[PDB]
Write a sequence for this structure.
């Protein structure tokens, strides 16, 4: 996954935390 601190959108939900911050993890 990405990892809290990485940047993501409402598409790549493969974030190490699950919920992608408003532009991050």
């Amino acid at each position: 996954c990405k990892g809290t601190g990485k940047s993501c959108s409402r598409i790549a939900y493969n974030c190490c935390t699950g919920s992608c911050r408003s532009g991050k993890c």
Notes: Residues 1-25 form one domain. The two ends are 10 Å apart (CA to CA).
